[PDB]
Curated annotation (Swiss-Prot), chain A:
The gene is RPL35A. This is Large ribosomal subunit protein eL33. Component of the large ribosomal subunit. The keyword Ribonucleoprotein applies. It comes from the Eukaryota. It comes from Homo sapiens (Human). It is found in: Cytoplasm.
Curated annotation (Swiss-Prot), chain B:
Its main location: cytoplasm. SUPFAM superfamilies: RplX-like. The lineage of its organism: Eukaryota, Metazoa, Chordata, Craniata, Vertebrata. The modification N6-succinyllysine is found at residue 75. It is found in: Cytoplasm. This is Large ribosomal subunit protein eL20.
Curated annotation (Swiss-Prot), chain C:
The modification Tele-methylhistidine is found at residue 244. GO terms for cellular component: cytoplasm; cytosol; cytosolic large ribosomal subunit; cytosolic ribosome; extracellular exosome; focal adhesion; nucleolus; nucleus. GO terms for biological process: cellular response to interleukin-4; cytoplasmic translation; translation. It comes from Homo sapiens. This is Large ribosomal subunit protein uL3. One of its GO terms (molecular function) is RNA binding.
From Swiss-Prot, chain D:
GO terms for molecular function: mRNA binding; RNA binding; structural constituent of ribosome. It comes from the Eukaryota. This is Large ribosomal subunit protein uL13. The gene is RPL13A. It comes from Homo sapiens. Belongs to the universal ribosomal protein uL13 family. One of its GO terms (biological process) is macrophage chemotaxis. Coiled coil: none annotated. CDD domains: Ribosomal_L13.
RNA sequence: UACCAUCUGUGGGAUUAUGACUGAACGCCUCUAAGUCAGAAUCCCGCCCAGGCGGAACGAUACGGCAGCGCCGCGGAGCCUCGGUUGGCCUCGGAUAGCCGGUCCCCCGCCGGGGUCCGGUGCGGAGUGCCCUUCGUCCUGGGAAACGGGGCGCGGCCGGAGAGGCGGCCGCCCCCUCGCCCGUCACGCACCGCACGUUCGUGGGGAACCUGGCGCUAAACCAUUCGUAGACGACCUGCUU
RNA sequence: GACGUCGCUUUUUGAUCCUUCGAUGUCGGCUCUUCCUAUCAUUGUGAAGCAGAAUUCACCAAGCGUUGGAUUGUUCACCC
RNA sequence: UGGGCCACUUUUGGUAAGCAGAACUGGCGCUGCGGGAUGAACCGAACGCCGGGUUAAGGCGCCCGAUGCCGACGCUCAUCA
RNA sequence: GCUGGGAAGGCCCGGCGGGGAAGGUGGCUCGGGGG
């Protein structure tokens, strides 16, 4: 019943032109295209959810094929939406262009 | 000398009092500068070109911003300037419409950079004064000298071209 | 630097990949342009090269030196028995070109036509178009077929007739027939469609396709010579007699 | 947003539309661009034609069949501009280039959908009105595209069908207004709720 | 330098009726009707009178290059008004030294054929623009009269014919043969 | 064509800037891009303003150019604009826009229920209307 | 096999230089500024040659035996494997120095087109938009409905060809007056603060088992011949009537 | 186009010595393809001290063509 | 180690040269990194292995991080911009 | 806090007033369109 997370897109890693830093991720959240709108999402949890072959244990449920890399939004990256986030493990490069959930967790509203 | 929006300063200075003339004369300039440090630098430049006086054997007895006397009345401004191109240097007289003297001088700086590719270190402003409407020469100001002036805003180009970035309806320019 | 004496290009670059033809028949690749003011007619035919001989005729060319005198000219003889129209294909023109919309074949297609459809007629069961002529003789299949005709009439822009040669009238070893699409020109699509379905399952002679003393085009496959060198293949100049690793290079 | 984004190319400037499309298609977002024959290019027709003919001149003189392929359709010209703005020698750029699809005219999975517009690439927004421009369809047709007449007739058919559908929609809207005027006395309780919270001026 | 307003006005006679569907002028005098689309120029056009019928064109923040177009549009509309009131006629005379230029007018004044231009055997045929009628004059001997309502069509047809009869590989200071526009008048002369 | 003009006394609507969403009277014109500007009854003191930031309305006040604030203020008050505007439908369109922005969650629920029922009633009446309008049997 | 014999060798478009038309700038003039014209061994295309890790239409689709295959089932039970995704928008043409909507009088075999007239225009008949909206049941009222809802239930008809793979309407019968809004009444694992929950989805692909009804019973390659072909492959042919 | 003066080119010859001396086969011709244009001819033009014919000077233009010989190893040259 | 080479400014021969020869300082050689698309020497800055923050030079349509600012004022149309 | 102990600006029909002018208001003269 109902979505309860905002949809973002893994846009790429933090980088200059010829050096990329894979510990920080760049996220484009749908609907926000300025810094003073990115202010709401500034400490929210975020998740890269994906499927694989083997079964993993699910908290409060039965084992299935879904896996999650957890992270959180850390700050804004440049004048038009585009936050930068920090995950527990660095995100795989096959996730670029794909969906990342922003979870409305720890709440300040 | 770079820019911004300019302020007008009056800088008053003098040579240092030697035990030959115990009271050297004071000199005063109106100087359009980004800040008072640039104002004092330009003062020493101009007064060193005019009088045999340098920053070492001299002092600034006053450096203070001239506020605009009537910043709510639209005035005409005549600027007498000199500058130098890639070839030799030229005298010039420009006219502007503005609320502030420093605003008109800033307008003159951006205009000289636009039309003659002249840099601020090339420009020297030598006179700036408030012209009435019936004494102006330039048609770009005399066309605004009209009491019953009236014009539309014909072709309103959309500016928020990215909010939204994808719409379903094409914009309208007539309003 | 500067090849020092002008000579033109040996051979033509408008003719190359200079490879074996992928077909044996000879594709038209361009039919005549359609104008609906003309009557309905065919635009091509399929013959067989018999041989050559020569003729004697009297020329009527005013101002020419051979005016009202007799000349001898070589001729080529092409045997053209009448072609059997057995099918009809329609084409619609799209922004990607011109695609085939719908083909309709006829009942009772001949064995040389089915021979064209098979690669080994000896070991086959000869089952081609049997379920199709079933739907021709049926009545539920019959209303389906006229629905296809009506849809072709209301949508297609180019119709062509599938006709085969009848090889039993030829002195050749080949019993397998040659099929061909021949564009139908000169009318509305409805007019040429009823005309072609009138001519369906039927013989068309070269007397009806072509006429006396008109100028036509011949499309075919050039006589085969095999792997040749540059002197035969491009007619380059032979190198002098004292050339170490070969002259014909 | 997990649906396809369908843009109408008519009235848009080539490189600006290509840049917008390229960033979208790298970020995800399957994009269809229809009516690529209506795309405009700034600068006059002759100098745009000369730019294309210089491109046609660029040819691998040892093997032109191996050389650069000069596509002629306006859809493929737009596609090659987006290809030039993409990182197409990588798997990511190739996946984005596959995520993009372009068409001449409007083919019929998309003729019965709503087409969007990118105002940052529109000619009326990005060019002064006293400036020359060219048409991608005319440019393509004069550099060797074969299919501008068939596309024009199919577009005329599509416009007739769209006029019929639009007249149906207008009759439905008139009926809905009539129905509001009929039963306003039983929706007056609900109408004032919507007016209170900013819907229904 | 952008002038705030540049404008000027065309008077309209009583027997003409003009309509403005935007930047599209339809002129409706007695000799027919004309229509011209000016949607390549950013001006505004307005009808003023109810019994005097002035037409203003306005430019509103243009520079020099687009302030020219004001007077150009007004002159085009005045040529339309003249074309529907009086109609344009171009009288062009045939000029030859030795070989007489034989002009024959095929169907209903819409085709002209010049036969013996400079003694050549090639027959040149010029198609008139639609709405322009050519004829041989009766008052003077070797003279074409080509008439119409559109000045652009009539003058382009005259220039077509004139550049058709042209001399090649010879001295065009001698060899002065051709057909040249002698005068650009009207019909009904009032 | 061109029903609205930049002139002295023309009332414009400031749409963005520090004075966004405001009403403004044009006092004078400063050189093709700015206007001397004063809203004394809408709490905007006199300054220069870009034509890119202002949008022209249909109200024109009556005072000579470069007049003082008391003159523009009493010209605003005699035939006050704060009642002509706001009961113009541009202004209540803005007002509806901002209350729709301020609409809360429980309000959103009530709007959903009301709009759902209203659409049900309108849709049923539309169905009845077209099924009655199909009663056509004339030669 | 030879200019050492014989045959065949082609059409348009935009335009370049140039020559002009109307016509300002500059109350005159001016091929030029806006707008038009003619224009070539050039250029592009046709014609002709090849035919894409590019498509299309159509044919035939495996036993005399246990022997396969296809279709109609949600018809069932399961296995592996690839994972994305987490409501929909079912559509005028367009203009931008202008648009959009609705009506009274003319015309088109009683709908569409004009001319009035009336609205709106920082687009509210609004993509900053619109439509759907999900905790579920039980007693009990009120209006909304009553000309209804739901049958992967039957049959028929019409429209869609550019890539139609779709959409719409009638007749037969079978269940409910429930579902939409405001209320009354209580109950459900209320799993004791905690993550991958929530859809698309009966997803896609691949083997295998059971279960019925309707059907179908082929080709290709080799070998062999041919010589219109050919280095070899390839290619063109024939083989109980 | 004198006296002067501004350039371009790398089809001349110099100047230089950066690459190559555990090796880049060193003149010319023959053969064959492609490119350039600073156009000799041909297409379309403008100018002339362009009457015609012939010629000269320019422009768009490199699509197409630019030969057979005597002498010389010759590139160049010169003649038929 | 006693083959040096390059750059601002000064400077000799030479028409000049990515030529030859000096002075002064810095570099490269012996040196990676950010920028100059690419590059011994330019511009920034010199380096143990990492996290956070911020910068230089340089940028911010898309490739490609960053203007998706309702940025400011002008100039400019190029049939080799 | 400082500044020209900020400059401008608001209100007090600022009041006795004194002048001055045009990007010239009213009133007048002339020219055009609506009873
Ligand atoms: Mg040569
Ligand atoms: Mg030997
Ligand atoms: Mg004139
Ligand atoms: Mg001559
Ligand atoms: Mg021969
Ligand atoms: Mg020209
Ligand atoms: Mg032309
Ligand atoms: Mg032509
Ligand atoms: Mg050397
Ligand atoms: Mg050296
Ligand atoms: Mg060596
Ligand atoms: Mg070696
Ligand atoms: Mg070797
Ligand atoms: Mg070698
Ligand atoms: Mg040239
Ligand atoms: Mg060629
Ligand atoms: Mg040594
Ligand atoms: Mg040195
Ligand atoms: Mg060393
Ligand atoms: Mg060191
Ligand atoms: Mg270093
Ligand atoms: Mg670097
Ligand atoms: Mg560089
Ligand atoms: Mg760091
Ligand atoms: Mg960059
Ligand atoms: Mg970026």
């Amino acid at each position: 019943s109902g979505r309860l997370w905002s949809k973002a897109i893994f846009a790429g890693y933090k980088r200059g032109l010829r050096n990329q830093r894979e510990h920080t991720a760049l996220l484009k959240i749908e609907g926000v295209y300025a810094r003073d709108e990115t202010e709401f999402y500034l400490g929210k949890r975020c998740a890269y959810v994906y499927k694989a072959k083997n079964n993993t244990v699910t908290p409060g449920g039965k084992p299935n094929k879904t896996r999650v890399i957890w992270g959180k939004v850390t700050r804004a990256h440049g004048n038009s939406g585009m936050v930068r986030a920090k995950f527990r493990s660095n995100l795989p490069a096959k996730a670029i262009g794909h969906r990342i959930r922003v979870m409305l967790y720890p709440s300040r509203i | 000398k770079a820019s911004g929006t300019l302020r007008e300063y009056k800088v008053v200075g003098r040579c240092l009092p030697t035990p030959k003339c115990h009271t050297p004369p004071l000199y005063r300039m109106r100087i359009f500068a980004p800040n008072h440090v640039v104002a004092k630098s330009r003062f020493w430049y101009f007064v060193s070109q005019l009088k045999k006086m340098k920053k070492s054997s001299g002092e600034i007895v006053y450096c203070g911003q001239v506020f605009e006397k009537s910043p709510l009345r639209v005035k005409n401004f005549g600027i007498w300037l000199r500058y130098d191109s890639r070839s030799g240097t030229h005298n010039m007289y420009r006219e502007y419409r503005d609320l502030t003297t420093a605003g008109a001088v800033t307008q003159c700086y951006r205009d000289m950079g636009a039309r003659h590719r002249a840099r601020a270190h090339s420009i020297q402003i030598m006179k700036v004064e408030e012209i009435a409407a019936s004494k102006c020469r330039r048609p770009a100001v005399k066309q605004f000298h009209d009491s019953k002036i009236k014009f539309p805003l014909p072709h309103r180009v959309l500016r928020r071209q990215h909010k939204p970035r994808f719409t379903t309806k094409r914009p309208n320019t007539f309003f | 630097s500067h090849r020092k004496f002008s000579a033109p290009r040996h051979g033509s670059l408008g003719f190359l990949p200079r490879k074996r033809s992928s077909r044996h028949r000879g594709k038209v690749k361009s039919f005549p342009k359609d104008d609906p003011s003309k009557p309905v007619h065919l635009t091509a035919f399929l013959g067989y090269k018999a041989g050559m001989t020569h003729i004697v005729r009297e020329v009527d060319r005013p101002g020419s030196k051979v005016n009202k005198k007799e000349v001898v000219e070589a001729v080529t003889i092409v045997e053209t028995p009448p072609m059997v129209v057995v099918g009809i294909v329609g084409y619609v023109e799209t922004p990607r070109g011109l695609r085939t919309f719908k083909t309709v074949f006829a009942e009772h297609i001949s064995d040389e036509c089915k021979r064209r459809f098979y690669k080994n007629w000896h070991k086959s069961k000869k089952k081609a178009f049997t379920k199709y002529c079933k739907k021709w003789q049926d009545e539920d299949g019959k209303k389906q077929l006229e629905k296809d005709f009506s849809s072709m009439k209301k949508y297609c822009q180019v119709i062509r007739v599938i006709a085969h040669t009848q090889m039993r009238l030829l002195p050749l070893r080949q019993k397998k027939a040659h099929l061909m699409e021949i564009q139908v020109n000169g009318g509305t699509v409805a007019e040429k469609l009823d005309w072609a379905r009138e001519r369906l399952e039927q013989q068309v002679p070269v007397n009806q396709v072509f006429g006396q003393d008109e100028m036509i085009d011949v499309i075919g496959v050039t006589k085969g010579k095999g792997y040749k060198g540059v002197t035969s293949r491009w007619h380059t100049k032979k190198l002098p007699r004292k050339t170490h690793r070969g002259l014909r290079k | 947003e997990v649906q396809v984004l369908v843009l109408d190319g008519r009235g848009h400037l080539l490189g600006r539309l290509a840049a917008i499309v390229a960033k979208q298609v790298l970020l995800g977002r399957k994009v269809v661009v229809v009516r690529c024959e209506g795309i405009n290019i700034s600068g006059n027709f002759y100098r745009n034609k000369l730019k294309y003919l210089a491109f046609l001149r660029k040819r691998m003189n040892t093997n032109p069949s191996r050389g650069p392929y000069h596509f002629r359709a306006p859809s493929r010209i737009f596609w090659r501009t987006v290809r030039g703005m993409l990182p197409h020698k990588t798997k990511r750029g190739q996946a984005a280039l596959d995520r993009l699809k372009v068409f001449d005219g409007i083919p019929p999975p998309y003729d019965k959908k709503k087409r969007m517009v990118v105002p940052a690439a529109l000619k009326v927004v990005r060019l002064k009105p006293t400036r020359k421009f060219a048409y991608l369809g005319r440019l393509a047709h004069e550099v060797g595209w074969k299919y501008q007449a068939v596309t024009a007739t199919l577009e005329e058919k599509r416009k007739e069908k769209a006029k019929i559908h639009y007249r149906k929609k207008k009759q439905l809207m008139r009926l809905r207004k009539q129905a509001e005027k009929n039963v306003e006395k039983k929706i007056d309780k609900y109408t004032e709720v919507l007016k209170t919270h900013g819907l229904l001026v | 330098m952008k002038t705030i307003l540049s404008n000027q006005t065309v008077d309209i006679p009583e027997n003409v009726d003009i309509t403005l569907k935007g930047r599209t002028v339809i002129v409706k005098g007695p000799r027919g009707t004309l229509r011209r689309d000016f949607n390549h120029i950013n001006v505004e056009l307005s009808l003023l009178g109810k019994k005097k019928k002035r037409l203003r064109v306005d430019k509103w923040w243009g520079n020099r290059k687009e302030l020219a177009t004001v007077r150009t549009i007004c002159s085009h509309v005045q040529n339309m008004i003249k074309g529907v009131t009086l109609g344009f006629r171009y009288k062009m005379r045939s000029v030859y030294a030795h070989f007489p230029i034989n002009v024959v007018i095929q169907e209903n004044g819409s085709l002209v054929e010049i036969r013996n231009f400079l003694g050549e055997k090639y027959i040149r045929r010029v198609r008139m623009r639609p709405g322009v009628a050519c004829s041989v004059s009766q008052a003077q001997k070797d003279e074409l009269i080509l008439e119409g309502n559109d000045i652009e069509l009539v003058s382009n047809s005259a220039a077509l014919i004139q550049q058709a009869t042209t001399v090649k590989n010879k001295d065009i200071r001698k060899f002065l043969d051709g057909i040249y526009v002698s005068e650009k008048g009207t019909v009904q002369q009032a | 064509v061109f029903r609205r003009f930049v002139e002295v006394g023309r009332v414009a609507y400031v749409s963005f800037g520090p004075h966004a969403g405001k009403l403004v009277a044009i006092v004078d014109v400063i050189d093709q891009n700015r206007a001397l500007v004063d809203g004394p009854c809408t709490q905007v003191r006199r300054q220069a303003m870009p034509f890119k930031c202002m949008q022209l309305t249909d109200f024109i006040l009556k005072f000579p150019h470069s007049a003082h604030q008391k003159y523009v203020r009493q010209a605003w008050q005699k035939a006050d604009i704060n009642t002509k505007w706001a009961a113009t439908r541009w202004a209540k369109k803005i007002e509806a826009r901002e209350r729709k922005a301020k609409m809360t969650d429980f309000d959103r629920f009530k709007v959903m229920k009301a709009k759902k029922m209203r659409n049900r009633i309108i849709k049923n009446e539309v169905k009845k209307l077209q099924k009655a309008a199909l009663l056509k049997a004339s030669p």
